[PDB]
Amino acid sequence: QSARMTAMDNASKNASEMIDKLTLTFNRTRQAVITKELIEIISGAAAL
Amino acid sequence: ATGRIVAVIGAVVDVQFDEGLPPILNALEVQGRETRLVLEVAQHLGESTVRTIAMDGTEGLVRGQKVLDSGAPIRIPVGPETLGRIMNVIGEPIDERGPIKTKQFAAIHAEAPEFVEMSVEQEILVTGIKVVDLLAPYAKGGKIGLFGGAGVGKTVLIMELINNVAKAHGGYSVFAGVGERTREGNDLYHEMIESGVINLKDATSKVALVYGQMNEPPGARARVALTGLTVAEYFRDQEGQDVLLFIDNIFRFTQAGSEVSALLGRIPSAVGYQPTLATDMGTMQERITTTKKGSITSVQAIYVPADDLTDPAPATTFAHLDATTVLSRAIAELGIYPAVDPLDSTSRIMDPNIVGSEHYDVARGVQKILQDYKSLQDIIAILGMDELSEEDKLTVSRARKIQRFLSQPFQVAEVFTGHLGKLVPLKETIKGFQQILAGEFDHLPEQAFYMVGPIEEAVAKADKLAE
Amino acid sequence: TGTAEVSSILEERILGADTSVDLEETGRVLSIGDGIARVHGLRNVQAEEMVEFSSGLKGMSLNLEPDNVGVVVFGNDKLIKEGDIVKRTGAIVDVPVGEELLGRVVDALGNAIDGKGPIGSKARRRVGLKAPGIIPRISVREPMQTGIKAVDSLVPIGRGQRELIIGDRQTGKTSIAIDTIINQKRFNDGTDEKKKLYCIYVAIGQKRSTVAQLVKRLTDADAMKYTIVVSATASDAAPLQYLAPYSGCSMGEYFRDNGKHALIIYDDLSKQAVAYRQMSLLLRRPPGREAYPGDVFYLHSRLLERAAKMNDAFGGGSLTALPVIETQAGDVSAYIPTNVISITDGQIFLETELFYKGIRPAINVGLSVSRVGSAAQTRAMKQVAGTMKLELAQYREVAAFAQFGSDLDAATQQLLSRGVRLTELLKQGQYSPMAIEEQVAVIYAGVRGYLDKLEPSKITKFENAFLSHVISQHQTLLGKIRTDGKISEEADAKLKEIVTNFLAGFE
Amino acid sequence: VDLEETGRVLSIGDGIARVHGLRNVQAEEMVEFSSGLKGMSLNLEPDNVGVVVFGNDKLIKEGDIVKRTGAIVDVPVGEELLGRVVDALGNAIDGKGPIGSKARRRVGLKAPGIIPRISVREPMQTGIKAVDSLVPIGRGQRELIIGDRQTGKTSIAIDTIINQKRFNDGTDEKKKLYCIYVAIGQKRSTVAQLVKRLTDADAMKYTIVVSATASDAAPLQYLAPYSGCSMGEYFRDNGKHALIIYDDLSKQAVAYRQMSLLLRRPPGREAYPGDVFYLHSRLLERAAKMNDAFGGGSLTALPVIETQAGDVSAYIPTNVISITDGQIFLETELFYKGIRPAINVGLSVSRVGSAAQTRAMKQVAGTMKLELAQYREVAAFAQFGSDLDAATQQLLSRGVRLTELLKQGQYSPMAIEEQVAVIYAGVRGYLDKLEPSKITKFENAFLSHVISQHQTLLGKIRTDGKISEEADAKLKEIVTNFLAGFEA
Numbered sequence A: 001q002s003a004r005m006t007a008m009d010n011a012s013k014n015a016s017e018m019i020d021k022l023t024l025t026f027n028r029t030r031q032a033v034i035t036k037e038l039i040e041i042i043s044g045a046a047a048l
Numbered sequence B: 001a002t003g004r005i006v007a008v009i010g011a012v013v014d015v016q017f018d019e020g021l022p023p024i025l026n027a028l029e030v031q032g033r034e035t036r037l038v039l040e041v042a043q044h045l046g047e048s049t050v051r052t053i054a055m056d057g058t059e060g061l062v063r064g065q066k067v068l069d070s071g072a073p074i075r076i077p078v079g080p081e082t083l084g085r086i087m088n089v090i091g092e093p094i095d096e097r098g099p100i101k102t103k104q105f106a107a108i109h110a111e112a113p114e115f116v117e118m119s120v121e122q123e124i125l126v127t128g129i130k131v132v133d134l135l136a137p138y139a140k141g142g143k144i145g146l147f148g149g150a151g152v153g154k155t156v157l158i159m160e161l162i163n164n165v166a167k168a169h170g171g172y173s174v175f176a177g178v179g180e181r182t183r184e185g186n187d188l189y190h191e192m193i194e195s196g197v198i199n200l201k202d203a204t205s206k207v208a209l210v211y212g213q214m215n216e217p218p219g220a221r222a223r224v225a226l227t228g229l230t231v232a233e234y235f236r237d238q239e240g241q242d243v244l245l246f247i248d249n250i251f252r253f254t255q256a257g258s259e260v261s262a263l264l265g266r267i268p269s270a271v272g273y274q275p276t277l278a279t280d281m282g283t284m285q286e287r288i289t290t291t292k293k294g295s296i297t298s299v300q301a302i303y304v305p306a307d308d309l310t311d312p313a314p315a316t317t318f319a320h321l322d323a324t325t326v327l328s329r330a331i332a333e334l335g336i337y338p339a340v341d342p343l344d345s346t347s348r349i350m351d352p353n354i355v356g357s358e359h360y361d362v363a364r365g366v367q368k369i370l371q372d373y374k375s376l377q378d379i380i381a382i383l384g385m386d387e388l389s390e391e392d393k394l395t396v397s398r399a400r401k402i403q404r405f406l407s408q409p410f411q412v413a414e415v416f417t418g419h420l421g422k423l424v425p426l427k428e429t430i431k432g433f434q435q436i437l438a439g440e441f442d443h444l445p446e447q448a449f450y451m452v453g454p455i456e457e458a459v460a461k462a463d464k465l466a467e
Numbered sequence C: 001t002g003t004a005e006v007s008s009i010l011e012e013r014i015l016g017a018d019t020s021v022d023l024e025e026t027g028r029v030l031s032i033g034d035g036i037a038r039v040h041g042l043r044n045v046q047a048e049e050m051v052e053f054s055s056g057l058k059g060m061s062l063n064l065e066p067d068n069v070g071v072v073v074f075g076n077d078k079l080i081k082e083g084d085i086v087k088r089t090g091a092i093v094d095v096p097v098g099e100e101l102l103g104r105v106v107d108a109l110g111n112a113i114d115g116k117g118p119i120g121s122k123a124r125r126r127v128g129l130k131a132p133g134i135i136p137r138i139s140v141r142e143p144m145q146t147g148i149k150a151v152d153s154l155v156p157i158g159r160g161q162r163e164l165i166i167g168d169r170q171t172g173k174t175s176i177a178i179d180t181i182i183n184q185k186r187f188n189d190g191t192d193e194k195k196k197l198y199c200i201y202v203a204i205g206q207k208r209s210t211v212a213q214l215v216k217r218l219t220d221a222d223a224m225k226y227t228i229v230v231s232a233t234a235s236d237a238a239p240l241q242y243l244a245p246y247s248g249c250s251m252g253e254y255f256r257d258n259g260k261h262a263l264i265i266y267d268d269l270s271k272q273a274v275a276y277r278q279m280s281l282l283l284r285r286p287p288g289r290e291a292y293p294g295d296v297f298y299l300h301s302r303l304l305e306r307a308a309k310m311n312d313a314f315g316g317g318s319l320t321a322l323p324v325i326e327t328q329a330g331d332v333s334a335y336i337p338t339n340v341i342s343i344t345d346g347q348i349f350l351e352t353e354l355f356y357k358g359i360r361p362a363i364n365v366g367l368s369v370s371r372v373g374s375a376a377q378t379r380a381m382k383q384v385a386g387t388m389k390l391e392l393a394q395y396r397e398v399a400a401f402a403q404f405g406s407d408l409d410a411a412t413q414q415l416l417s418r419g420v421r422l423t424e425l426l427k428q429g430q431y432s433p434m435a436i437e438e439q440v441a442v443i444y445a446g447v448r449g450y451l452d453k454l455e456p457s458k459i460t461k462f463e464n465a466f467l468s469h470v471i472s473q474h475q476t477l478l479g480k481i482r483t484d485g486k487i488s489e490e491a492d493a494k495l496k497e498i499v500t501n502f503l504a505g506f507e
Numbered sequence D: 001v002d003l004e005e006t007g008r009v010l011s012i013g014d015g016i017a018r019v020h021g022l023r024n025v026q027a028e029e030m031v032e033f034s035s036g037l038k039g040m041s042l043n044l045e046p047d048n049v050g051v052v053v054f055g056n057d058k059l060i061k062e063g064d065i066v067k068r069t070g071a072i073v074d075v076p077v078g079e080e081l082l083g084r085v086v087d088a089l090g091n092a093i094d095g096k097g098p099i100g101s102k103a104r105r106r107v108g109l110k111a112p113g114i115i116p117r118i119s120v121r122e123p124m125q126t127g128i129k130a131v132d133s134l135v136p137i138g139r140g141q142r143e144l145i146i147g148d149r150q151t152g153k154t155s156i157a158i159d160t161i162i163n164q165k166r167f168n169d170g171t172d173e174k175k176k177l178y179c180i181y182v183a184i185g186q187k188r189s190t191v192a193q194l195v196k197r198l199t200d201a202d203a204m205k206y207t208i209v210v211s212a213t214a215s216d217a218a219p220l221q222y223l224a225p226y227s228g229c230s231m232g233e234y235f236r237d238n239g240k241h242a243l244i245i246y247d248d249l250s251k252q253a254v255a256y257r258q259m260s261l262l263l264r265r266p267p268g269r270e271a272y273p274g275d276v277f278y279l280h281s282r283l284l285e286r287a288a289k290m291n292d293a294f295g296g297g298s299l300t301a302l303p304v305i306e307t308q309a310g311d312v313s314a315y316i317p318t319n320v321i322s323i324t325d326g327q328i329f330l331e332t333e334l335f336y337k338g339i340r341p342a343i344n345v346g347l348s349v350s351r352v353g354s355a356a357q358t359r360a361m362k363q364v365a366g367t368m369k370l371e372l373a374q375y376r377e378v379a380a381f382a383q384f385g386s387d388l389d390a391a392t393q394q395l396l397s398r399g400v401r402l403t404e405l406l407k408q409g410q411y412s413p414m415a416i417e418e419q420v421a422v423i424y425a426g427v428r429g430y431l432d433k434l435e436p437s438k439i440t441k442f443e444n445a446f447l448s449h450v451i452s453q454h455q456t457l458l459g460k461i462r463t464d465g466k467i468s469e470e471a472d473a474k475l476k477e478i479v480t481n482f483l484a485g486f487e488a
């Protein structure tokens, strides 16, 4: 029980770190998708 | 001059001048309306054509409709006769208590101060709150920002900032509500009246209100910061005073500028914003800097979208920020009002070269002892060594006393709670936290620090609790 | 490259001076697109002004670009041809309002659609007026009761405000609106003018058969005294769906200027944003984000900030806006949900895993909050809901620890058990809104904790049997709660006694 | 009057003045508005000239008379700009009188070809122990300071600037320095306190400060590092060594993005157009050591690039790493751990700096880089370590002691012989019986002791750039003698 508590503490910490990293790459992917869709709409309305 | 409305899209109406023409960033009175319809000129295209962002409901505008041109960029009534007054970005009073009978007008769309009109001394602006002036202190000319919400005590901290700066320093303040909700603006106006910051009875009020509401077009919302900054620049440049521009929202300012530049036909930037984002924030956020004469200081409530820091509006905002005091509900449900988080409040002025070695030593001791208390609180919550050591129990007692001591009774909460509001200067905060961290007051209970102003009144509260 | 420079109007211009079409009051139709005419002439038309087309149609005119008037057609574009004659009406489009619109489904120009006779309106209010300012309004001073226990306890509505119902598609979200309507029957049956009520359901771009289902549900719940139903369905044109919320909001603005209270339910207000994006992109206005143009926030704010309580000088009238937003798979970070959540004064959030997890109505909170939702309650519901909100706040942290709650300590076990009993108290059958008095009684029983020993699947059966018992036997106690407005120690002692006795005689 | 040499503004809009006529104009030419302003005539069309202004559009009407200057976009230049805050166009904005410039350096010439260049060979010390020991700079070189918001970025450049005072109060002109600080998009208050700290540290004789802050216009922020390269390029062509710092060169690309989008140019990646690489390449590429036939001189560019939440590969950091031949990298989680500066030594390069060493620092910091590269596999083994090897724990502890030695406060850069003496007391393990809460205390202690009592061996280190064997024995003597005589 002592070593299991230690292993689950360290696994929660590693999972929280990877949640933080994946949230950062989710946000930059979100911004890239918004900018891509925006450039497509603006390019369409300008080439019209 | 006299020109003519020739086309209308909302806050984009363009005027065809045939004679003498207003420059870029100017004002226009559209006539024939029941109100004024002020317009802002920019873009001269031909037949003297100017693309004016049109500032109110443009229903009723006809082709060829006469427009008087006033010259000046926008004139607003500034003065000490503007305090307690609600105005909107035309300069027009919307609290329905007569006009603002002042002497000197002032033009919004002014410029930044020159490099020779600067102060090379980062004087620590002392609010008077213990947790603020000890763990994230303010700066004369700062551009600081508070991260609050609804349930937290944001309004109480704002009115306490106004009263502490008006008492300690000699500065009045201005509150620019940018995209201010009319319900929330009305409640904040009645809250200031029932707190005593605004007085409707005589000339002793302490704040001037500029409410640019959400129901106005974004041309009339990207100027609210400019209008409140113009009033505060009157206080800076003709009294030499210690002024506070409280902008309730920097994100609605950026959103209003984004929608203006979307309506003006400009190709938008990145994540949805305008190309001119950093430039517009540069103009405003560099007019709020300190000068050699006065010390305008912005405290601004800031909204981050999608809980993201890399979004361009918080990117430019945090490029101009200085303190970022966090308000929250966790330490508010710990009873401390309001939960200004210091562990998430990274002030730039916290530096022993600027605020001093004693102040920085005390602040590092407090922040380190609360970080260690958070770790040992996790361990004492999971019960691994159950009181880990005498040092564990000592730092838990010390930092629990400190977290109870970070509270302060506020003078704006005096009218309905009998806990009288104290002003605590910087030297007394330093002496109090230094004597708590030095183990001098270890023999006191933790309850003797909750809602007390200075440390000697915490001594007297420990004495009056021992019954 | 000009839009009005075509050889027809040039030829009639330079073959001889016309002065015959008059070019000011009338105007000839130039290029007619998919739903937008760009008419030539109308030198004296104003902006946002409703003109009529010689077919017999109407259509409101925006963009004026120095030679052309951008009139958007209020109907099918099959029967408008190039060269037709437009005519000014002379005024920005009005909505016929009054107390004769009640109980009759109308259409966004203010004309009857259900075929049961015309509307007997006496005055027409100009649509799209400015919102009332700071001094004429005051804050939420009356409690707006949904009838949903979860809403009226955790996130109550205030007569005087705006509360945005937000969720995914088919996640409650209109059932809460129909419960909000049907709850106001018992307040519209009797006296107290400052309690009686007028609901306005503005359906924007729905199916028309579901508007028929909505009006049949309201008629067989007898919900047509309070109610107006404004309908601009998906078969109707883009500007007529655009103009539907302002029409109903003008009706509600009539109701709140004349002393009385009113609420409005903007069902599918995101579809109103979609219709405005359609008509603007065909006007070639520059698209902003997600092709929504610049003034979309200005649109929804000018619509939604007309709801406020009025000060005692300006009657006592209040409006309650309830916009409805479908999100696309929980994407609260989209354009329109972020705009309207920044506008509105509360949100009722429905995450859908609770719906399929079996707690209906689907208000799955934690994201859901009302920014004034403590002062907009009666003191009975204020006390009980405050303690109940703190208990659920202690519950929702530890539910992932409650899936393994069997081998933990006892303090958690008690807290998680109490939270499970309260969370299954908050569920409620569809189309049966509870009055304030009986939900105060039920949530009181759950807070005082006469339920911690019962099985979880027996909580709802206890709830129904307790409603039957309290309505049948103890009428005077609910009279005490609804007339005093609160529990004052005698309702408390009597509820101690009756809940102990009914728990003694339940099974 | 005359449409050959003058012209009239047809339509000044967002950032463009379309001026009519102006037939004698030539491409990319500073053409001045009778509002007292300047602009540069960009794209020439058969109907109009697109001049982008160098200020706000508020001062310019329609039909305001525009007049040619007659020369391509220039900036005043020389040693008479030393000690002074200038604008991006050359006007002195510090208020203490006008400039005495005689020459006039063009703002947009090309970088030198591959023959007048010669590779980096002179040592440029920033004064920082970490930078000059591990990631050094050469006179001749492009070295990008990459980091996040509020990390360490400006203070490294201010230490690099303040360090040069001892060389500039010296004798040889082949060591003195002339530094340019191009503040792009900064707060004006930060530039004011920068000039105050440099005046307080008497650190201005080298220093020009080219200021185009945030309240200044965006095509004025477009022009500022080009003007700074013209300053340092004058010094480089005359054969005097020069430094330049580009404070927030990301904001230069943001300003170029915004004026590019106002010119309706097609946006590319995260709204930056295709011309961003050409922008920073023609900017940075003017740094080189000069061949001794071409006078003999150098420029040293240090751009400062700003990443959002530790994003080394966003779009612009990839461009300005692909241009600069060194990426001094920084982190933020180190900066919260208390190490100042927060150099991520394993990921921080400077590339071609390890040919412009002192050869004392080669004798004392190659072993340091190896012993600190031994530390970059054992931090996880120290996290999960209760039964470790004695040698593994020894090398882990020496890496802890070296990364405690590399901490350094603001505004006190080290001399190079002081760096060699401190690192000599640090590498081969005199710290190994000390505790890491005392190494910076110990370091300040024997730094004061060596700079007071034992100046002669520091003179022997800085004179002959090598630890001589007798000097090696005497410096070992004095480190052991101080370590014996220093209690707590």
Ligand SMILES: Nc1ncnc2c1ncn2[C@@H]1O[C@H](COP(=O)(O)OP(=O)(O)O)[C@@H](O)[C@H]1O
Residues within 6 Å of the ligand: C168, C169, C170, C171, C172, C173, C174, C175, C176, C326, C360, C361, C362, C428, C429, C430
């Ligand atoms: N007991 C209940 N409580 C709440 N909502 C329910 C209940 N039973 C059914 N519903 C759902 O509420 C929905 C109301 O329609 P709505 O969600 O607005 O349709 P849409 O999918 O177009 O948004 C119905 O589709 C129905 O499935």
Ligand SMILES: Nc1ncnc2c1ncn2[C@@H]1O[C@H](COP(=O)(O)OP(=O)(O)O)[C@@H](O)[C@H]1O
Residues within 6 Å of the ligand: B348, B351, D148, D149, D150, D151, D152, D153, D154, D155, D156, D340, D341, D408, D409, D410
């Ligand atoms: N002892 C120190 N050594 C190095 N840097 C420090 C030290 N103390 C504080 N700093 C940091 O130096 C920074 C100077 O700003 P910097 O991050 O270099 O550029 P900017 O914040 O303008 O992007 C301050 O934010 C401050 O946090």
Ligand SMILES: [Mg+2]
Residues within 6 Å of the ligand: C170, C174
């Ligand atoms: Mg539906």
Ligand SMILES: [Mg+2]
Residues within 6 Å of the ligand: D153, D154, D247, D248
């Ligand atoms: Mg910097």
